[PDB]
Amino acid sequence: NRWVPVTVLPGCVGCRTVAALASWTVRDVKERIFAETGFPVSEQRLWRGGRELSDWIKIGDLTNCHLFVNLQSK
């Protein structure tokens, strides 16, 4: 009877899963995305639950949960 937000993805084509540590920052995740894909860190905006994630936020502070972030433009 407690609430559970369920987000349904129609496909998740192009989704990338990375093995981060709890000590990583959001900036580290971006750096690893750039290492893996060439997508430039300066253009990366990571979003979680409708709110943009600041670079200095510790990944371990964000959760154990499977962390989903949305890479979005502008």
From Swiss-Prot:
Highly expressed in the central nervous system. Also found in skeletal muscle and at low levels in pancreas. It comes from the Eukaryota. Residues 4-74 form the Ubiquitin-like domain. Co-chaperone which acts as a regulator of the Hsp70 chaperone machinery and may be involved in the processing of other ataxia-linked proteins. It is linked to Spastic ataxia Charlevoix-Saguenay type: A neurodegenerative disease characterized by early-onset cerebellar ataxia, spasticity, retinal hypermyelination, pyramidal signs, and both axonal and demyelinating neuropathy with loss of sensory nerve conduction and reduced motor conduction velocities. Other features include dysarthria, distal muscle wasting, nystagmus, defect in conjugate pursuit ocular movements, retinal striation (from prominent retinal nerves) obscuring the retinal blood vessels in places, and the frequent presence of mitral valve prolapse. The ubiquitin-like domain mediates interaction with the proteasome. This is Sacsin. It comes from Homo sapiens (Human). The lineage of its organism: Eukaryota, Metazoa, Chordata, Craniata, Vertebrata. The gene is SACS. The chain holds residues 6 to 81 of 4579 of the full protein.
